[PDB]
Amino acid sequence: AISKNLPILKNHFRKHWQERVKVHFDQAGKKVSRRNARATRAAKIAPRPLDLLRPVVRAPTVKYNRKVRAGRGFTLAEVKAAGLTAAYARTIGIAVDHRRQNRNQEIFDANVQRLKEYQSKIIVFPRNGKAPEAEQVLSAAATFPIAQPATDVEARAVQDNGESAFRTLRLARSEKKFRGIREKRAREKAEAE
Amino acid sequence: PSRFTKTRKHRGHVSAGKGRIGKHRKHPGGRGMAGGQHHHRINMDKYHPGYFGKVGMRYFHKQQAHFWKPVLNLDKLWTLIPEDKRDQYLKSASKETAPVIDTLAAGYGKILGKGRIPNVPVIVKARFVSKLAEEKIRAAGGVVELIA
Amino acid sequence: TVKTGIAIGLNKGKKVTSMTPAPKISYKKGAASNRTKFVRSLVREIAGLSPYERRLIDLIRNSGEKRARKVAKKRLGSFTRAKAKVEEMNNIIAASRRH
Amino acid sequence: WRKWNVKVNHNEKRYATASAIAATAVASLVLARGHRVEKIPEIPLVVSTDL
Amino acid sequence: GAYKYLEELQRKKQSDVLRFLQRVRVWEYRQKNVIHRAARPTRPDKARRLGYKAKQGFVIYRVRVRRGNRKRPVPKGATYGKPTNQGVNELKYQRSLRATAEERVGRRAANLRVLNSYWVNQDSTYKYFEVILVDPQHKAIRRDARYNWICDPVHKHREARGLTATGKKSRGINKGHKFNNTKAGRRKTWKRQNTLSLWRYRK
RNA sequence: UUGACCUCAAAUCAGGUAGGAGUACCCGCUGAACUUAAGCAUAUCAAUAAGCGGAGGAAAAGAAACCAACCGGGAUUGCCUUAGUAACGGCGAGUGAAGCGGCAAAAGCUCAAAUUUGAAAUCUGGUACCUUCGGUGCCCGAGUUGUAAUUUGGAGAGGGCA
RNA sequence: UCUUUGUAAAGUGCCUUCGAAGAGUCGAGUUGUUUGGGAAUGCAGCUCUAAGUGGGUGGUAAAUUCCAUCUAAAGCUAAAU
RNA sequence: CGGACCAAGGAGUCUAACGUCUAUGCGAGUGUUUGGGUGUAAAACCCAUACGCGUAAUGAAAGUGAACGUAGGUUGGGGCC
RNA sequence: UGACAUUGUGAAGAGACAUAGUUUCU
Ligand SMILES: [Mg+2]
Ligand SMILES: [Mg+2]
Ligand SMILES: [Mg+2]
Ligand SMILES: [Mg+2]
Ligand SMILES: [Mg+2]
Ligand SMILES: [Mg+2]
Ligand SMILES: [Mg+2]
Ligand SMILES: [Mg+2]
Ligand SMILES: [Mg+2]
Ligand SMILES: [Mg+2]
Ligand SMILES: [Mg+2]
Ligand SMILES: [Mg+2]
Ligand SMILES: [Mg+2]
Ligand SMILES: [Mg+2]
Ligand SMILES: [Mg+2]
Ligand SMILES: [Mg+2]
Ligand SMILES: [Mg+2]
Ligand SMILES: [Mg+2]
Ligand SMILES: [Mg+2]
Ligand SMILES: [Mg+2]
Ligand SMILES: [Mg+2]
Ligand SMILES: [Mg+2]
Ligand SMILES: [Mg+2]
Ligand SMILES: [Mg+2]
Ligand SMILES: [Mg+2]
Ligand SMILES: [Mg+2]
Ligand SMILES: [Mg+2]
Ligand SMILES: [Mg+2]
Ligand SMILES: [Mg+2]
Ligand SMILES: [Mg+2]
Ligand SMILES: [Mg+2]
Ligand SMILES: [Mg+2]
Ligand SMILES: [Mg+2]
Ligand SMILES: [Mg+2]
Ligand SMILES: [Mg+2]
Ligand SMILES: [Mg+2]
Ligand SMILES: [Mg+2]
Ligand SMILES: [Mg+2]
Ligand SMILES: [Mg+2]
Ligand SMILES: [Mg+2]
Ligand SMILES: [Mg+2]
Ligand SMILES: [Mg+2]
Ligand SMILES: [Mg+2]
Ligand SMILES: [Mg+2]
Ligand SMILES: [Mg+2]
Ligand SMILES: [Mg+2]
Ligand SMILES: [Mg+2]
Ligand SMILES: [Mg+2]
Ligand SMILES: [Mg+2]
Ligand SMILES: [Mg+2]
Ligand SMILES: [Mg+2]
Ligand SMILES: [Mg+2]
Ligand SMILES: [Mg+2]
Ligand SMILES: [Mg+2]
Ligand SMILES: [Mg+2]
Ligand SMILES: [Mg+2]
Ligand SMILES: [Mg+2]
Ligand SMILES: [Mg+2]
Ligand SMILES: [Mg+2]
Ligand SMILES: [Mg+2]
Ligand SMILES: [Mg+2]
Ligand SMILES: [Mg+2]
Ligand SMILES: [Mg+2]
Ligand SMILES: [Mg+2]
Ligand SMILES: [Mg+2]
Ligand SMILES: [Mg+2]
Ligand SMILES: [Mg+2]
Ligand SMILES: [Mg+2]
Ligand SMILES: [Mg+2]
Ligand SMILES: [Mg+2]
Ligand SMILES: [Mg+2]
Ligand SMILES: [Mg+2]
Ligand SMILES: [Mg+2]
Ligand SMILES: [Mg+2]
Ligand SMILES: [Mg+2]
Ligand SMILES: [Mg+2]
Ligand SMILES: [Mg+2]
Ligand SMILES: [Mg+2]
Ligand SMILES: [Mg+2]
Ligand SMILES: [Mg+2]
Ligand SMILES: [Mg+2]
Ligand SMILES: [Mg+2]
Ligand SMILES: [Mg+2]
Ligand SMILES: [Mg+2]
Ligand SMILES: [Mg+2]
Ligand SMILES: [Mg+2]
Ligand SMILES: [Mg+2]
Ligand SMILES: [Mg+2]
Ligand SMILES: [Mg+2]
Ligand SMILES: [Mg+2]
Ligand SMILES: [Mg+2]
Ligand SMILES: [Mg+2]
Ligand SMILES: [Mg+2]
Ligand SMILES: [Mg+2]
């Protein structure tokens, strides 16, 4: 079973695979069922808006850190700085993440201002009774979209201090490459009697 | 669909087009890639030279992404500017006011230099340039601004 | 730290205005406490030393902190827990059968 | 697990339905399709929004 | 508090005081039945930190399970099959004696829910365990919002489904790259990655 | 002599619980060989079938002893993808995951270790009455070899001040 | 709509002192099994067996120096499946 | 060698991944259908962010990365002038 | 068949810090 000039294929069908075939015949089913599930949650949830407030966050790794992206919750620092407690911010549809830490000021002001605008654009019904029907906005994500931070201006003055950029890269690369060796030349040399 | 299939045409002739001498048995050569060093080696060297044996280094738990670095040539480059805005800067090429192109914002990792861009000054922010890419930018009066 | 601002090199990274957040107690899980100093210290003198610990302080006093470390490395798991186990035995010696 | 549904390119799809709209004029195709239309005002047949 | 002292003392099992106790205790347990009900916890600091409580509806049971490999039964050593499967004698069983200990008592006390268990002693033949169980019909527990989760029906013989602490252990249930194979539940996750999934609009 | 305590017994003692079924799906144990490698033993079939124990309407997993190496992310589960890839492999036949990204759903927490010590503040049962999925009084009993309040690392506690 | 549960319970600011955090376990040798996991991915048996500025992880073994990152050996939990 | 006779059953299928070729859409791009929206409801209509393949190659790798010139010279070239 | 664990208490004799007794074997 090797013949002709054909690409060598790797079709893993040597277990009892026919036993584990999942045809998503219920694809339309489960969408109908998912839409109804939300239409019930909408109605159960009073004028509350189906989702919670999510923070801005810079995506990890050298591939996605350009983008900004909704994170889990708001850190204890941002919540406080935006003037409320963790325990209470939860009952106000705000997601709080005890695990996230604040190391970048920009993101920090970003989320604290995100909490200001959230508070300013909601209303919290009294515990009493009244329940002054005020009709649900359905998301919150949609209400307070997350936008990509603008980083510069369209045009600007060309400044050429004259230093190759390319060669800056080679040099910075090299300095790291010989950093430990050149330190073994400082310990063997400062050792000289 | 089955009505265009050649087996409709084979109905009535004894062998289904599979030969009376040679038959259509189960697996004559053996199943799969069996005997690529033996009865099937003529077909593996040629069509597949290089198939057997090892080369280079192993790399446990390599995460592609570490190596994420799409490439863009001066070739294009001016395409990262919307077309209306584009002609505005192509004309009135100067210092003082020269477009900034955040090629990482466009999702590129390195600028290569495939070839020739107009003599307009451009300010190129990028993570990595090639020596030529960077030189060819300057000949047009632009600079490269190493970012991260 | 402070990132250089470029894509390779030594402190490689994006320049960002820093913050250094407030510190987490869960980082202090190993820390001492007078409560655990007292009780472990009071226990030590009740139950004393163990067979391998006796063979360990005699082995120091008659063979030094290297054969002691060697045999302690095999007795415990590691070279590093043995490093720290020898020291404990040094301070069993010094503080006791000396001053 | 026979293939039941079929993927058509969204754009080819529009071309098809665009073309199908285009020929709802063209008196002849409508006649050729069944559709007793010899006694109608004109083609296309636009009627009052009051419908 | 006296609990913190007991805990620290118990990490000195090679100390003359503790091995006096362990040698005299292990002899006693080997005179009682392999499964026998315990008067009280004999490590009250360990019990209480695994979920034990000193109130009606908390049971302690002490159990003895033999040590060593699992000899594959198989008459006369005869395996019938390939030589990779010829092993009879260095085969070890993927569950700890702790699991064996809990399981045999939990059957003995079918009306109890096994909460946890701790090691107590061992000789060359037997490991000895004490197993802490809860009576889910005792109103002292059925009330008590803290422990009454145990009374739900989803916690029947949690010791035979690998849901006690030792079960989750041998079932390899922990987050991380060191646990990819067994983490959402090894057979589940196997089956997943071995499902062929075809959509209506094949991709 | 009399009364306790500890540990262990017995009752057709008062009240209860377990078994068995089923098993499509779920948590475990145990475990082949046909087969494939054109022979065959490693491998493969397959961590599959058969055998054994245990659950539910789902089960399990789950609020990081996690992922990362970034400008960092942030419980679990599942899809799309990562990928027939990194890697394993008589490196043969064959095998083969994970992080990031988009999406569905979203949700969070509690014990142990603390002197209430100016008051075991806690709890099963019996019993009478009541407004009976329960409350009250009373009495035996549990419990200091520790039952409650307080605290759970994101913290938090004792002081003092506002 | 009836009881006010309360001389009750909780939230927050500043100063001071503290800040308890799971062991025959973590870990180590060996054996067997398993895994894509490769000087060893999980699991189990036997032997050895810790610590508190400690412990675990950081996908090539070791010695030294740093750095990052969580907080094990106890527990509950709806949905998407 | 099979076949006493007759009726009725009776054998290149479906799937995953591919080679060449062809038709069609769009074209340095392309792919609505995991999902959301919506609906006369498994249909049809609509769509944000990603992702996949393509637009760069080459080394085991660290790495580097495509104009001497009208994107070259020569010779044949349909077509056109 | 060996080692380790179960495995403890005496006494005589050998064995080292190199002929005080913690430790090891007959
Ligand atoms: Mg050929
Ligand atoms: Mg498959
Ligand atoms: Mg097969
Ligand atoms: Mg189905
Ligand atoms: Mg459905
Ligand atoms: Mg939602
Ligand atoms: Mg950031
Ligand atoms: Mg990312
Ligand atoms: Mg009301
Ligand atoms: Mg047909
Ligand atoms: Mg035909
Ligand atoms: Mg023909
Ligand atoms: Mg014919
Ligand atoms: Mg043919
Ligand atoms: Mg023929
Ligand atoms: Mg024939
Ligand atoms: Mg012939
Ligand atoms: Mg022939
Ligand atoms: Mg050949
Ligand atoms: Mg190969
Ligand atoms: Mg290699
Ligand atoms: Mg490498
Ligand atoms: Mg270059
Ligand atoms: Mg089409
Ligand atoms: Mg100790
Ligand atoms: Mg009792
Ligand atoms: Mg056989
Ligand atoms: Mg085999
Ligand atoms: Mg014995
Ligand atoms: Mg696997
Ligand atoms: Mg499973
Ligand atoms: Mg499993
Ligand atoms: Mg589909
Ligand atoms: Mg297809
Ligand atoms: Mg009775
Ligand atoms: Mg049953
Ligand atoms: Mg079963
Ligand atoms: Mg098997
Ligand atoms: Mg067999
Ligand atoms: Mg078969
Ligand atoms: Mg094979
Ligand atoms: Mg074969
Ligand atoms: Mg054959
Ligand atoms: Mg054979
Ligand atoms: Mg196979
Ligand atoms: Mg196998
Ligand atoms: Mg199977
Ligand atoms: Mg079965
Ligand atoms: Mg349920
Ligand atoms: Mg039921
Ligand atoms: Mg459900
Ligand atoms: Mg936690
Ligand atoms: Mg996560
Ligand atoms: Mg591969
Ligand atoms: Mg292959
Ligand atoms: Mg396999
Ligand atoms: Mg696979
Ligand atoms: Mg995501
Ligand atoms: Mg909850
Ligand atoms: Mg409080
Ligand atoms: Mg408490
Ligand atoms: Mg802990
Ligand atoms: Mg050994
Ligand atoms: Mg097995
Ligand atoms: Mg290795
Ligand atoms: Mg292994
Ligand atoms: Mg560390
Ligand atoms: Mg190391
Ligand atoms: Mg972090
Ligand atoms: Mg609990
Ligand atoms: Mg659970
Ligand atoms: Mg013949
Ligand atoms: Mg005949
Ligand atoms: Mg047939
Ligand atoms: Mg076909
Ligand atoms: Mg075309
Ligand atoms: Mg393009
Ligand atoms: Mg559709
Ligand atoms: Mg419609
Ligand atoms: Mg429908
Ligand atoms: Mg529409
Ligand atoms: Mg969107
Ligand atoms: Mg694309
Ligand atoms: Mg690509
Ligand atoms: Mg290509
Ligand atoms: Mg190009
Ligand atoms: Mg190249
Ligand atoms: Mg490369
Ligand atoms: Mg170089
Ligand atoms: Mg040249
Ligand atoms: Mg040149
Ligand atoms: Mg020439
Ligand atoms: Mg002997
Ligand atoms: Mg003795």
UniProtKB/Swiss-Prot annotation, chain B:
Start-end of Basic residues biased regions: 1-13, 20-29
Location of the protein in the cell: Cytoplasm
Residues spanned by motif Nuclear localization signal: 6-12, 23-29
Described function: Component of the ribosome, a large ribonucleoprotein complex responsible for the synthesis of proteins in the cell. The small ribosomal subunit (SSU) binds messenger RNAs (mRNAs) and translates the encoded message by selecting cognate aminoacyl-transfer RNA (tRNA) molecules. The large subunit (LSU) contains the ribosomal catalytic site termed the peptidyl transferase center (PTC), which catalyzes the formation of peptide bonds, thereby polymerizing the amino acids delivered by tRNAs into a polypeptide chain.
Cross-link (Glycyl lysine isopeptide (Lys-Gly) (interchain with G-Cter in ubiquitin)): 95
Full protein name: Large ribosomal subunit protein uL15
Record-linked Pfam families: Ribosomal_L27A (PF00828)
Stated family: Belongs to the universal ribosomal protein uL15 family.
Listed GO MF terms: RNA binding; structural constituent of ribosome
PANTHER family assigned to the protein according to its UniProt record, in alphabetical order: 60S RIBOSOMAL PROTEIN L27A, LARGE RIBOSOMAL SUBUNIT PROTEIN UL15
Disulphide connectivity of cysteines: none
GO biological process: cytoplasmic translation
Alphabetized UniProt keyword annotations: Cytoplasm, Isopeptide bond, Ribonucleoprotein, Ribosomal protein, Ubl conjugation
GO cellular component: cytoplasm; cytosol; cytosolic large ribosomal subunit; nucleus
Species this protein is from: Saccharomyces cerevisiae (strain ATCC 204508 / S288c)
Location of the region described as Disordered in the Swiss-Prot/TrEMBL record: 1-38
Keyword Ribosomal protein carried by entry: yes
UniProtKB/Swiss-Prot annotation, chain C:
Source domain of life: Eukaryota
PTM annotation: N-terminally acetylated by acetyltransferase NatA.
Keyword check for Ribosomal protein: yes
Record InterPro entries: Ribosomal_eL36 (IPR000509), Ribosomal_eL36_sf (IPR038097)
Cellular compartments per GO CC: cytosol; cytosolic large ribosomal subunit
Principal subcellular localization: cytoplasm
Keyword Transferase attached: no
Entry's localization field: Cytoplasm
Keywords for this protein: Acetylation, Cytoplasm, Ribonucleoprotein, Ribosomal protein
Molecular-function annotations in GO: RNA binding; structural constituent of ribosome
Modified residues (N-acetylthreonine): 1
GO biological process: cytoplasmic translation
Function comment: Component of the ribosome, a large ribonucleoprotein complex responsible for the synthesis of proteins in the cell. The small ribosomal subunit (SSU) binds messenger RNAs (mRNAs) and translates the encoded message by selecting cognate aminoacyl-transfer RNA (tRNA) molecules. The large subunit (LSU) contains the ribosomal catalytic site termed the peptidyl transferase center (PTC), which catalyzes the formation of peptide bonds, thereby polymerizing the amino acids delivered by tRNAs into a polypeptide chain.
Family in the record: Belongs to the eukaryotic ribosomal protein eL36 family.
Subunit structure and binding partners: Component of the large ribosomal subunit (LSU). Mature yeast ribosomes consist of a small (40S) and a large (60S) subunit. The 40S small subunit contains 1 molecule of ribosomal RNA (18S rRNA) and 33 different proteins (encoded by 57 genes). The large 60S subunit contains 3 rRNA molecules (25S, 5.8S and 5S rRNA) and 46 different proteins (encoded by 81 genes).
The encoding gene: RPL36A
Curated annotation (Swiss-Prot), chain D:
Compartment(s): Cytoplasm; Nucleus
Post-translational modification: N-terminally acetylated by acetyltransferase NatA.
SS bond list: none
Miscellaneous notes: There are 2 genes for uL4 in yeast.
Record note on quaternary structure: Component of the large ribosomal subunit (LSU). Mature yeast ribosomes consist of a small (40S) and a large (60S) subunit. The 40S small subunit contains 1 molecule of ribosomal RNA (18S rRNA) and 33 different proteins (encoded by 57 genes). The large 60S subunit contains 3 rRNA molecules (25S, 5.8S and 5S rRNA) and 46 different proteins (encoded by 81 genes). uL4 is associated with the polypeptide exit tunnel. uL4 interacts with its chaperone ACL4 and the nuclear import receptor KAP104.
Entry text on domains: The eukaryote-specific C-terminal extension harbors a nuclear import signal and delivers the ACL4-uL4/RPL4 complex to the pre-ribosome, triggering uL4 release from ACL4 and incorporation into the 60S ribosomal subunit.
Similarity field: Belongs to the universal ribosomal protein uL4 family.
Name of this protein: Large ribosomal subunit protein uL4A
Species per Swiss-Prot/TrEMBL record: Saccharomyces cerevisiae (strain ATCC 204508 / S288c)
Residue span relative to the full protein: 106 to 156 of 362
From Swiss-Prot, chain E:
Taxonomic source organism: Saccharomyces cerevisiae (strain ATCC 204508 / S288c)
Biased composition (Basic residues): 168-184
Pfam families noted in UniProt: Ribosomal_L15e
Additional information: There are 2 genes for eL15 in yeast.
GO CC terms: cytosol; cytosolic large ribosomal subunit
UniProt protein name: Large ribosomal subunit protein eL15A
Task of the protein: Component of the ribosome, a large ribonucleoprotein complex responsible for the synthesis of proteins in the cell. The small ribosomal subunit (SSU) binds messenger RNAs (mRNAs) and translates the encoded message by selecting cognate aminoacyl-transfer RNA (tRNA) molecules. The large subunit (LSU) contains the ribosomal catalytic site termed the peptidyl transferase center (PTC), which catalyzes the formation of peptide bonds, thereby polymerizing the amino acids delivered by tRNAs into a polypeptide chain.
Keyword Ribonucleoprotein: yes
Coiled-coil features, chain-numbered ranges: none
Transmembrane helix as UniProt keyword: no
Transmembrane segments: none
Annotated compartments: Cytoplasm
Subunit-level organization: Component of the large ribosomal subunit (LSU). Mature yeast ribosomes consist of a small (40S) and a large (60S) subunit. The 40S small subunit contains 1 molecule of ribosomal RNA (18S rRNA) and 33 different proteins (encoded by 57 genes). The large 60S subunit contains 3 rRNA molecules (25S, 5.8S and 5S rRNA) and 46 different proteins (encoded by 81 genes).
Region ranges (Disordered): 163-184
GO biological process terms, semicolon-separated: cytoplasmic translation
Similarity comment: family membership: Belongs to the eukaryotic ribosomal protein eL15 family.
Major subcellular site: cytoplasm
